[PDB]
Design a protein around this ligand. Structure first.
Ligand code: MG
Ligand code: ZN
Ligand code: ZN
Ligand code: ZN
Lengths: 66, 45, 51, 97, 44, 263, 49, 144, 48
RNA sequence: CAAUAGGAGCUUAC
């Protein structure tokens, strides 16, 4: 839905890295290198960011009913 | 009386149990009640 | 033109009102673009015909 | 319901007399039933979705009947093949080896 | 010309799904029904 | 007799070698830093107007998971030991979040930096959500479209990671000892040869490999422990380590107190 | 209704394994332990309890 | 429709035997496999005759009989609960009365909440049915 | 199990299950036991 | 101090 604040397995804060990860992906860097620069070294933390699907963009498209 | 809202045109209003169910601005058919006024607490867990 | 009855419509078919209306108006009509149709709506309940 | 009450405990289908046995109660949180792992063989049960039924005797005659005829220790040996039906299983066996 | 690889096959399959989707049998059956079957039942 | 040799030391993580201590001590320290070091986290959320697409308890969970500066949290009291009714100023920190999107294009992101500390037991340096830098935007909390609004009053309280993970000051405490398996505490699975098929520990070069002529030693116990503490910014690495030690000390002092005052 | 019938004072829920229970012990959820009941005649050995 | 968990295959403590499985409490605390649940209750007014119909209204004890054992103190003056209100089991979310055919001349036909579920009211909808009589849908929300 | 059942009775035989389970479970907790993809792989000569 | 029935359909564990 939206990027989780913590890593499930260990608890590192990944919620402040989703925008940086997307910016890294625009200039062409592949996912492993972007995850390296954000200093996600354990594969638990890495799969936290690498497997996120951002569904809030899809949910926000339906007009607010208030 | 109690505040309602349109489902199509997002108009806010308040009906008083005897007029039919309708919007003023557009005249649409489906309405939703408004959120309560009381204060709601969550545990953040 | 004698009215002989109402036939339920299969969603996302050529006679559905959602067949047109590219993604923007689909969003405005509260319809999910991933919803593929193939079912009927009877009394507000989605029904699918099993082959 | 309190600790050590005898209750009849049962899994369907009840193919033989050792599919429904009387157990002593221990009260616990966390809404599942808890079983020692060696009794899962007579019930033919495992822990991947199964549910089991619990019947509470409402008198002293039925408490005594359960505890003196249907109790788990009394059903270890079966008359079907005059051998035990409860054994050491499924990790204690590997670990003891 | 070169050898068709597995990725070429998945490109072909993506073309197939871009055209038909996953519920095309329901939709095509009902479209056939409303185009021809009702009129044919009336003229039976 | 216990000794510490710091190998790397920055604000968020410290990498250190621990020596001349029992393995139980080192593991107790690891466990204490993971589970029993108090921090501050939002434990009560009050929704005034939430017309965003996200649900109320979704947002409450996310807000509870936000790290807050907890340097002075030890001079604070647990909300279950204060005489006060509904939160006072000395056992709780009250935060406000107000966000709103005006216009009919674009999306307004609601970040953790938008949380504002209103009250709290001043002048204690607790409560603020942790920012990595001066230019940090913080954690993503929600997203807002036209006329959607979020109005929230959060309460922050003191707790430990046993009750809930949001109070954990640490992410991952790397921990190992005896890189060369001199003590034979492990028994390597292999297909052909256990020496070729197993990668070396990152502290392999910190200890002498066993000589081929060497025989097994049955007197050697584990004596050197290589551990890397990481934090979430709520506490600093030296603070996490020192307060884990202090928490363990006070747990032992509690045991000693009960023993002596049981006579 | 005669060879088999529905009965009161019964419960049902998912089962779990517990290495730390004795063989003739069953772990009963608190909610079920409070919903089900046993009628105990009052006597001069159990009146305080 | 899932999450990538970190899985070890081990005989760790004996609590994962026979298709049991040990899960990290801390990972649950951080949001692993957490889900929202939405339940929607429906009700409408019927027409039993000419001027005999049902009504959405909070049923007062004096004029009504056979009232449910739940609490009615959560309904507004229109017989509908409002979104944003905490609701427990057996609580009434749609108050409705059916008139007694020929004071104290009404029976209730209120819809309570399911005896098992807790949660928070999310979206109370109100419209009219095919025949123009009042129609209500109430969606509840909770987290599992 | 059959021998203990026949000689000592049902109670002692029931307690035997618990004793063995507890001892072996503690030892395996502190020893460990796993299985991996490598436990199903035979070497090249056996494959030949 | 009182919460219908009958059917069909989809599922759970053997
Ligand atoms: Mg099973
Ligand atoms: Zn991680
Ligand atoms: Zn309107
Ligand atoms: Zn206070």
């Amino acid at each position: 839905m939206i990027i989780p604040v913590r890593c499930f397995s260990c608890g590192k804060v990944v919620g402040d890295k989703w925008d940086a990860y997307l910016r890294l992906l625009e200039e062409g860097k592949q996912e492993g290198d972007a995850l390296d620069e954000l200093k996600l070294k354990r594969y638990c933390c890495r799969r936290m960011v690498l497997t996120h699907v951002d569904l809030i963009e899809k949910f926000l498209r339906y007009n607010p009913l208030e | 009386g109690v505040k309602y809202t349109c489902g199509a045109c997002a108009h806010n209003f308040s009906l008083n149990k005897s007029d039919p169910v309708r919007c003023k601005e557009c005249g649409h058919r489906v309405i939703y009640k408004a959120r309560t006024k009381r204060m709601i607490q969550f545990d953040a867990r | 033109k004698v009215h002989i009855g109402k036939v339920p419509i299969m969603l996302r078919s050529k006679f559905c009102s959602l067949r047109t209306l590219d993604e923007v108006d689909l969003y405005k009509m509260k319809e999910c673009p991933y919803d593929m149709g193939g079912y009927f709506v009877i009394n507000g309940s989605e029904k699918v015909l099993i082959a | 319901l309190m600790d050590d009450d005898p209750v009849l405990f049962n899994r369907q289908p009840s193919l033989h007399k050792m599919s429904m046995m009387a157990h002593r109660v221990k009260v616990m949180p966390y809404s599942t039933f808890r079983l020692n792992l060696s009794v899962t063989s007579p019930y033919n049960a495992d822990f991947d979705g199964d549910e089991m039924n619990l019947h509470v005797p409402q008198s002293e005659e039925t408490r005594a009947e359960l505890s003196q005829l249907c109790a788990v220790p009394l059903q270890i040996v079966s008359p079907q093949s005059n051998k035990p039906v409860m054994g050491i299983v499924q990790d204690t066996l590997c670990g003891v080896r | 010309d070169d050898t068709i690889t597995t990725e070429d096959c998945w490109t072909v399959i993506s073309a197939f799904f871009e055209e038909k989707g996953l519920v095309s049998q329901q939709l095509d059956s009902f479209d056939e029904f409303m185009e021809t079957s009702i009129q044919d039942l009336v003229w039976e | 007799e216990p000794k510490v040799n710091i190998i790397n030391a920055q604000d968020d993580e410290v990498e250190l070698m621990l020596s001349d201590v029992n393995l139980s001590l080192a593991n107790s320290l690891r466990r204490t830093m993971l589970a029993e070091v108090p921090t501050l986290a939002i434990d009560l959320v009050e929704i005034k107007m939430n017309t965003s697409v996200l649900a109320d308890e979704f947002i409450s969970h996310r807000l509870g998971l936000i790290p807050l500066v907890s340097e002075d949290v030890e001079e604070m009291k647990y909300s279950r030991d204060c005489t006060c009714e509904d939160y006072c100023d000395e056992c709780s920190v009250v935060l406000e979040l107000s966000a709103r999107h005006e216009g009919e294009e674009g999306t307004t992101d609601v970040y953790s930096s938008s949380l504002i500390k209103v009250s709290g037991p001043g002048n204690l340096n607790v409560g603020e959500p942790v920012r990595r830098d001066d230019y940090d935007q913080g954690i993503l909390l929600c997203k807002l479209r036209n006329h959607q609004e979020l109005n929230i009053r959060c309460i922050a309280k003191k707790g430990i990671a046993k009750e809930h993970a949001k109070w954990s000051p640490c992410s991952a405490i790397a921990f190992e000892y005896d890189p060369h398996n001199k003590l034979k505490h492990t028994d390597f699975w292999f297909e052909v040869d256990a020496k070729k098929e197993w990668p070396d520990s990152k502290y392999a070069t910190w200890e002498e490999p066993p000589k081929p002529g060497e025989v097994f030693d049955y007197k050697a116990k584990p004596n050197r422990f290589y551990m890397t503490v990481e934090t979430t910014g709520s506490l600093k690495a030296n603070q996490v380590f020192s307060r884990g030690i202090k928490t363990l000390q006070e747990k032992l002092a509690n045991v000693l107190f009960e023993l002596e005052n049981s006579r | 209704n005669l060879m088999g019938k529905r009965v009161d004072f019964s419960a049902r829920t998912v089962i779990s394994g517990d290495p730390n229970l004795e063989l003739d012990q069953v772990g009963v959820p608190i909610s079920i332990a409070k919903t089900l009941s046993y009628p105990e005649t009052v006597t001069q050995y159990n009146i305080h309890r | 429709a899932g999450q990538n968990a970190i899985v070890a295959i081990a005989c760790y403590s004996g609590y994962n035997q026979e298709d049991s499985m040990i899960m990290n409490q801390s990972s649950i605390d951080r949001g692993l496999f957490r889900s929202l649940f939405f339940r929607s209750y429906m009700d409408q007014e019927k027409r039993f005759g000419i001027s005999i119909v049902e009504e959405f209204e909070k049923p007062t004890r004096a004029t009504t009989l056979r009232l449910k054992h739940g609490t009615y103190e959560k309904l507004d003056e229109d017989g509908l609960i409002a979104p944003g209100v905490r609701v427990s089991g057996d609580d009434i979310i749609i108050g409705k009365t059916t008139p007694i055919p020929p004071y104290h001349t009404k029976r209730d036909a209120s819809t309570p909440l399911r005896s098992t579920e807790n949660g928070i009211v999310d979206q109370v909808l109100l419209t009219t049915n095919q025949e123009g009589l009042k129609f209500v849908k109430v969606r509840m929300r909770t987290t599992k | 199990i059959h021998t203990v059942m026949r000689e000592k009775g049902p109670k002692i035989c029931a307690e035997l299950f618990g004793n063995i389970q507890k001892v072996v479970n503690y030892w395996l907790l502190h020893n460990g036991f796993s299985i991996g993809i490598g436990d199903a792989i035979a070497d090249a000569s056996t494959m030949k």
